[PDB]
From a paper:
Here, we employ a bidirectional F420‐reducing [NiFe] hydrogenase from the archaeon Methanosarcina barkeri MS (MbFRH) as a unique model system to yield structural and spectroscopic insights into a scarcely explored reaction intermediate that is the initial target for H2 binding to the active site of the enzyme. Each asymmetric unit contains three subunits, FRH‐A, FRH‐B, and FRH‐G, and a total of four [4Fe4S] clusters as well as a flavin adenine dinucleotide (FAD) cofactor and the [NiFe] active site (detailed below). The FAD and the heterobimetallic [NiFe] center enable the redox conversion of the two substrates, coenzyme F420 and H2, respectively, while the [4Fe4S] clusters mediate intramolecular electron transfer (ET) between the two reaction sites.
To further explore the initial interaction of MbFRH with H2, we also investigated possible intramolecular H2 transfer pathways. To this end, MbFRH crystals were derivatized with xenon to explore hydrophobic gas channels connecting the exterior of the enzyme with the [NiFe] active site. These experiments revealed a second H2‐transfer channel that has not been observed in similar studies on other [NiFe] hydrogenases. Surprisingly, the unrelated [NiFeSe] hydrogenase from Desulfovibrio vulgaris Hildenborough features a similar hydrophobic tunnel, indicating analogous developments in certain hydrogenases that operate bidirectionally in vivo.
Numbering used by the authors:
A (entry chain A): 2 to 438
B (entry chain G), D (entry chain G): 18 to 270
C (entry chain B), E (entry chain B): 1 to 291
F (entry chain A): 294 to 438
Write the structure that this text describes.
């Protein structure tokens, strides 16, 4: 057993690090992936603020997935106070939600491809570079994200930190022209995401057929069960979500308990293995002390007393019984979600009545009852819980998808060459600002 | 000429500032192709440590009780010719003004300051989210300021001046800016621009004059920024057609 | 490309009026602002435009995103109090889904638009979707309570009876629907001006694509400046299409000489005001947005 | 020795600052008897114009569109050795930050600034209402600073120093002071003093840390003032028993 | 009138404990803070006192204006997280109608009281109605989530089972009602301290009328400093009345030598912290409330 | 007309006097008028203040509730309240909708007294015009608000 540490991680959102115990062959025996993002404390600063403000602050948790926190937070206030929003507000929120899933998955394509090979070769994708095919692939991705962000701004008021959601519905319905325009963009987008989906699935299939990859000069063997774990999965919807206002909620708050990293992470250790050649700047100097129990910046939520995986594979396993697991399975599941996003948008536009009401006639002020809302954010189940009384937030809690994935990914690190530990991590599409909030 | 060297430093931010930049689409790829190298950005590239930079786009604010974070921002000033506070968290604190600690697993992570409170800042790009157009414009103008003829470095230096004046004015942003420095000053003309730019619908105009929902406002500084009676540099803004043509040229294929 | 220091940069200046008779029925002057936006809509240069529509009190303007010929005509006539036109500039590109936004307003509102195009501060998507600006001349504006006091106390008229208002030839003019006319000396009205108009150094809407106003042309006719390439393409096409009667400004009385004189008084008066803010206090002064 | 000459100048205020002074009861009559002449105060005496003053207690803020008002406050600096911003309207604007015009019969009366924005101010007495004790203490200490032995003018000059430092810090007061300059600075210790001093119950403590109702706050600056982590001059405050005895002595019959 | 530079200005210092046996049943140490306020109430030196009463979560303190012997005893025992004692300082003189207010708290809370007495900023009537302060020694404090993490994860105890907590002899001590004991090394707890305690330069509550703490005296006994004339009149009267067992501090172990050493480490450590704020940045530093 | 900073409220189209004489004339038919009458009426209000306080304390239940169980947020309806302030009738009018003030108006006692005192100035030596004014106990900050 030796101790190697990668810090910081790269090609993910936010600031984390990997603290790995390895055997004499350099395979992980027990690795801890933990956040080291400073804790802004959204849930604690929320207390005493108005129910209108708290969702706009929580949105600023993360700029890749602001839709998820705006919606989960707003609908937790609606659930605590017993507010039923109009049908045309729900339709605009679903359009906003699906558009944002398209842009997030596409962004993640940018972050993972540098680890993938142009199929049948030993050249890795470089997207920066003004060469083919990398450059025409970047162009497709850029137009997908652009369509996605435009639809989001139209139905949501803003692509990053949507302004249109409010307690009781939306500020604005959209004009007949706006609806035509979102339809036109989603028609163009459906063709593109099918192309991109097929492209990415082929690249992943080629990776599943490799025996090694190249990391800073060396060949690194590619294990067959790369990134396997036994934690299972948790998901609340294939697309949108669920709240405590529902006749049959698809999440059970009685099965949840958040603990401290204390119960699941490693205690103090000292780094006795180092590699200055790891691209690009090497690992932690030998002799450095590390304590994942105390350096980890997140809490550990559990379901039936155990950490779980959330995200696109969690969703397909829960709702279609998708039966592959691990790193490449996670990549596959995520790409398969591309078309649903655009079919949803088009179905929703078709039912939207641009003359319809978007604000509930009555907004109650709340009596201190607990409500919750789950949003199936691009990376997994995003659950906000709230007690609102007299229009003020008296209690608030956020169980964010990457928070769920931290201890579960850590366990998935067993059996991997420490040089591709980051590849196991990237399959989760991590957002460390989200996880920490 | 050489491309300038640009880095993306991420403090206590949400990565939405980075996303905004990327939402320049092919304009960003044109910039990266012809005018700038991204020497650092943990989100997009594997460079683990802060190299030297001609321009550093710093997003987020600084948590005073995270040692590594105070070090990163000092290191960034040391390693960079131009420091840009990118976005309202970096310029003015924004939602991290509201942080006060007590959350797992670092209840002591309590205090957050905009970067200009710890280091000297040359340029502000205010907004939450910041507009892609502004980030692009500021990046092109930084390149002219460094690799252009004297006619461009003069243009570029006049364009950037109000964004540099904002960095010297202070580190505080709020709806009350419009009271203190506009209405209270005899300067408000009731155009309504502040209402359009506010990202949380905190501003209405009542009888032609601003009305702020101060418990909705997230303290981003956008409204004083966009107000045409905060800064109005007639030498740049009256040449709008020309400066627009130049900018479009610099990105044409 | 002339460059008057009191009339701004422009290509040409003619005296014009719309050939659309229905539009001229309630236009303030020559119907230039209405006719340019209607034509811009029908031709496809814009898909919508911010205008000063009817509001909730009489003679209170209310900004609105118009997207039909009919909605545009609803904004004819001058309203002498503030209409925060730019409050809908960003929303026009969001919920309304516009690609090619028009904007109408007075000079300070054109400046806001140009500032947003070059320094968008939380104004994403606005720079590239502003497609056409039409700016009115403006000597000064009033608050609603000011306009109430002028019309009801000084002119002694009921606002519900007023069909038209006009500042011209040193007097505030009120016209009633039943046919009477009342005036107020402009000396009486000076306490009622919005204080922020006293630092404004722009009279003929220098930063607009096209500019239009009353002074310099006979009643029923507008003084028009064409300024930007956008202004030129649209104005050429519209004259070609028959949308306008023109007359060179030189062969029209009072013409460009009167206009330059009133512009000059505005800038010099306000420039003095800007200068005194600097020493307004003792060892202290007031902010200058222009420094 | 001579009594010092004191005037009460009333700008755009509510006269509650004057009332507070009068609520010193017999202490005010003791002061007026033995240490000060009131050379000016429109509310209590018939002196129509601003005479020369050793200390000027200026209450209220300045409406920039009332000519006589801009003149009075300039005249006050010219005629006075020490200028005191008495109360939060004079120090920080307070409720006149919210003024925006449009009311009969002067719809143009629109813009209001605290006095320090037009003239130089030597001492701040913040509060809305300001505490009678503070106004008394500041008046007695001003007399020692001018007619006492060197041991008193030294005491008095150290006491007044934080009130002079406030006048140089700025002209803005708000609940957000406690965020910017205390919580965000690592300085908050959760004593709860800010909650006690807030006059509109805008402040609660949640888990030991301040929570501000920013749409209740009237922008008076009282909470940063009273906070024991804004200024804490150990040389004065640790001598509390002694300085209290001195002050009581100066008013004893 | 000694003047230690680490123990503040005081007249005398003895080691004491209350003779009221019922009060000693749950006092943290010698029962000095409880016994002084009870006695002050019964004698008439105060008509009410702010104390750290029971709150709404277990081991969360809640400030309250106590006005009976019974309410005062409810505040026995040390709570290791923040209790914003001063939030009720002004209200005590309003709705409660008190003339002679008592205050209890740690060192920073005594400083707030003294600051309010000399610089009342919207604190009318407070200076002359503060009548008696009793200050506890305090090395540092914690937030509730910190105290939760220490007790439940590190000590592995249930908060609903804890009868007493004690920091002493380098360990965090938890005592359960059923009889168990658990400890935590103080090195583990250092991440959990409230950051604002790191600039505090006061250990034995220098600015109180009377000060009291644990260090320097055996278990069940308090180290007490009498400081002000008010502190002296009340403490004399109470010993005369039989309220206290005393013992000179010199003839008690560890006694005043240990105390001065821990005080010295606090000030020097925190003073360093105060010094580094000055150069925390590059060409910039952090505020110093003491400058 | 142009320097006056207040509006002129009227009752049945005419300015009126408000304050302690207004109260005693309305409720007890107090039948003296003018400067010295106003001073007299004001002093006669001293004892009622203390008898009221004592009666109120006697009925006060210090354990009783002080906050209504439900606070509605308003639908835009107009309400008004009159307070008999030391100088006269203080009437605030409001429309509240969704917890926000949509319309507000204040008719303050010295505002009422300004045009009425002005008319009372006829027949006085201009050197004691101020004495006529002081009988109204003027508050010009109130009147202007
Ligand atoms: C305060 C104000 C002051 C003016 N001062 C002068 C002057 O000093 N000298 C001069 O020659 N002309 C002045 N004008 C312009 C002139 O009165 C006519 O309005 C102008 O010529 C347009 O006439 P038209 O026939 O082409 O427009 P119409 O066809 O009648 O259309 C009216 C246009 O005016 C806009 N508009 C109307 N009221 C407002 C308002 N409060 N704010 C913003 N936009 C509004 C509408 O959007 C619309 O496009 C002023 C206008 C305003 C609002
Ligand atoms: C964070 C904290 C840290 C301390 N650190 C030390 C130390 O390092 N060395 C040392 O010798 N003593 C320390 N003490 C004091 C010591 O623990 C005893 O509380 C003190 O001696 C009083 O004991 P007693 O028997 O006289 O009081 P009791 O009769 O038991 O009465 C308890 C008193 O404590 C007050 N109180 C209890 N908890 C709090 C709280 N969070 N905030 C404010 N007031 C409170 C109550 O108002 C009450 O008057 C500390 C106390 C606290 C709250
Ligand atoms: N998807 C996503 Fe976020 Ni940037 C995470 N984790 C959250 O809800
Ligand atoms: N009495 C009284 Fe005030 Ni200072 C007046 N007028 C108001 O309500
Ligand atoms: S300014 Fe807004 S978008 Fe940028 S890091 Fe801060 S929260 Fe995100
Ligand atoms: S943008 Fe500026 S000038 Fe225009 S309405 Fe707002 S504060 Fe007034
Ligand atoms: S009012 Fe809106 S735009 Fe201005 S600082 Fe607050 S959040 Fe930003
Ligand atoms: S005078 Fe100038 S600032 Fe005032 S309304 Fe006219 S264009 Fe606007
Ligand atoms: S500070 Fe408060 S009491 Fe003093 S004049 Fe201003 S409103 Fe009145
Ligand atoms: S008074 Fe100061 S130190 Fe005490 S709780 Fe309030 S901001 Fe924190
Ligand atoms: S919170 Fe209360 S004490 Fe602080 S500035 Fe606002 S009104 Fe004053
Ligand atoms: S260490 Fe000092 S500042 Fe922190 S609680 Fe103890 S007395 Fe207060
Ligand atoms: S400082 Fe604006 S609440
Ligand atoms: Fe959480
Ligand atoms: Fe009124
Ligand atoms: Xe990105
Ligand atoms: Xe990107
Ligand atoms: Xe870049
Ligand atoms: Xe970048
Ligand atoms: Xe710069
Ligand atoms: Xe860029
Ligand atoms: Xe730059
Ligand atoms: Xe007074
Ligand atoms: Xe008085
Ligand atoms: Xe005085
Ligand atoms: Xe006075
Ligand atoms: Xe002074
Ligand atoms: Xe005084
Ligand atoms: Xe003074």
């Amino acid at each position: 057993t030796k101790v190697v540490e990668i810090s910081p991680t790269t090609r993910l959102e936010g600031h984390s690090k990997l603290t790995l115990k390895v055997n004499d062959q350099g395979i992980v025996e027990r690795g801890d992936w933990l956040s080291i993002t400073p804790v802004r404390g959204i849930e604690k600063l929320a207390i005493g603020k108005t129910m209108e403000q708290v969702p706009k602050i929580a949105s600023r948790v993360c700029g890749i997935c602001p839709i998820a926190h705006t919606l989960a937070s707003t609908e937790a206030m609606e659930a605590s106070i017993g507010c039923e929003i109009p049908t045309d507000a729900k339709l605009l929120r679903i359009i906003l939600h699906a558009a944002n899933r398209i842009h997030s998955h596409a962004l993640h394509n940018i972050l993972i491809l540098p680890d993938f090979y142009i199929p049948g070769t030993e050249k890795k994708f470089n997207l920066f570079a003004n060469e083919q095919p990398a450059r025409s692939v970047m162009a497709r991705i850029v137009r997908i994200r652009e369509i996605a962000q435009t639809i989001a701004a139209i139905a949501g008021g803003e692509a990053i930190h949507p302004s249109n959601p409010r307690i009781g519905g939306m500020y604005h319905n959209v004009s007949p022209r706006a609806k035509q325009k979102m339809a036109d963009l989603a028609k163009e987008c459906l063709v593109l995401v099918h192309e991109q989906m097929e492209f990415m699935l082929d690249v992943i299939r080629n990776m599943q057929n490799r025996e090694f990859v190249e990391v800073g000069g060396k060949q690194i063997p590619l294990p067959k069960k790369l990134g396997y774990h036994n934690q299972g999965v948790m998901a609340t919807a294939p697309m949108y979500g669920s709240s405590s206002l529902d006749d049959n909620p698809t999440w059970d708050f009685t099965r949840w308990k958040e603990t401290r990293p204390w119960d699941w992470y490693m205690g103090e250790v000292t780094i006795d293995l180092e590699d200055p050649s790891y691209p690009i700047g090497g690992t932690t100097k030998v002799g450095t002390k590390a304590n994942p129990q105390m350096e980890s910046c997140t809490g550990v939520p559990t379901y039936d007393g155990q950490p779980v995986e959330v995200g696109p594979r969690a969703r397909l396993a829960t709702f279609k019984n998708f039966d592959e697991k691990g790193t490449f399975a996670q990549h596959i599941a995520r790409q398969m979600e591309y078309p649903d996003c655009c079919y949803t948008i088009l179905n929703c536009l078709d039912n939207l009545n641009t003359s319809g009401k978007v604000l509930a006639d009555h907004i109650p002020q709340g009596d201190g009852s607990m409500g919750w809302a789950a949003n199936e954010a691009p990376r997994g189940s995003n659950i906000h819980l709230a007690r609102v009384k007299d229009g003020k937030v008296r209690w608030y809690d956020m169980l964010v998808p990457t928070t769920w994935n931290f201890p579960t990914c850590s366990r998935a690190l067993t059996g991997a060459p420490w040089q591709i530990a980051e590849m196991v991590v990237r399959a989760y599409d991590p957002c460390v600002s989200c996880a920490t909030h | 000429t050489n491309k300038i060297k640009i880095g993306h430093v991420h403090m206590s931010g949400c990565t939405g500032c980075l996303v905004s930049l990327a939402d320049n689409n092919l304009g960003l790829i044109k910039i990266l192709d012809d005018y700038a190298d991204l020497v650092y950005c943990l989100t997009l590239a594997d460079v683990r440590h802060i190299p030297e930079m001609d321009v550093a786009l710093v997003e987020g604010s600084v948590c005073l009780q995270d040692h590594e974070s105070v070090e990163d921002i000092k290191e960034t000033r040391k390693k960079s010719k131009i420091v840009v506070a990118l976005g309202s968290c970096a310029c003015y604190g924004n939602i991290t003004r509201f942080s006060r600690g007590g959350q797992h697993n670092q209840p002591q992570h309590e205090s957050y300051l905009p970067i200009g409170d710890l280091i000297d800042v040359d340029v502000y790009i205010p907004g939450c989210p910041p507009s892609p157009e502004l980030i692009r414009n500021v990046a092109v103008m930084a390149y002219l300021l460094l690799e252009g003829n004297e006619e461009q470095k003069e243009l570029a230096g006049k364009y950037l001046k109000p964004l540099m004046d904002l960095a010297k004015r202070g580190t505080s942003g709020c709806f009350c800016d419009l009271m203190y420095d506009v209405i209270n000053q005899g300067l408000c003309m009731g155009c309504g621009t502040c209402a359009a730019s506010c990202p949380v619908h905190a501003i209405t105009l009542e009888f032609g004059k601003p009305q702020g929902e101060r418990d909705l406002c997230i303290k981003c500084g956008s409204c004083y920024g966009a107000c045409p009676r905060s800064f109005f540099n007639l030498d740049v803004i009256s040449e709008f057609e020309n400066i627009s043509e130049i900018i479009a040229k610099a990105l044409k294929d | 490309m002339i460059e008057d220091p009191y009339l701004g940069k422009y290509v040409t200046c003619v005296s014009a009026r719309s050939t659309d008779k229905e539009i001229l029925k309630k236009a303030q002057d020559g119907g230039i602002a209405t006719a340019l936006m209607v034509y811009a809509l029908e031709e496809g240069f814009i898909d919508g435009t911010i205008v000063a529509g009817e509001g909730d009190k009489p003679w209170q303007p209310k900004p609105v995103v118009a997207m039909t010929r009919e909605d545009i005509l609803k904004a004819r006539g001058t309203r002498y109090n503030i209409s925060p036109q730019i409050s809908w500039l960003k929303e026009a590109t969001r919920s309304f889904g516009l690609d090619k936004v028009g904007v109408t307003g007075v000079c300070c509102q054109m400046q806001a638009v140009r500032k947003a195009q070059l320094y968008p501060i939380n104004m994403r998507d606005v720079p590239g979707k502003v497609a056409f600006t039409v700016g009115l001349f403006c000597m000064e504006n009033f608050s609603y309570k000011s306009l109430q006091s002028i019309v009801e106390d000084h002119a002694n008229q009921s606002l519900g009876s007023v069909k038209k208002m006009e500042i011209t030839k040193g007097k505030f003019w009120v016209y009633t629907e039943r046919g009477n006319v009342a005036t107020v000396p402009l000396k009486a009205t000076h306490k009622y001006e919005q204080p922020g108009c006293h630092v404004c150094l722009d009279y003929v809407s220098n930063l607009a694509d096209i500019s239009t106003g009353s002074v310099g042309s006979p009643d029923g006719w507008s003084t028009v400046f064409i300024r930007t390439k956008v202004g030129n393409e649209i104005w050429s096409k519209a004259v070609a299409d028959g949308m306008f009667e023109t007359k060179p400004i030189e062969e029209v009385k009072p013409g460009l000489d009167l206009l330059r004189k009133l512009a000059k008084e505005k800038i010099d008066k306000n420039q003095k005001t800007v200068e005194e803010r600097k020493t307004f206090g003792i060892n202290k002064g007031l902010r200058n947005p222009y420094a």
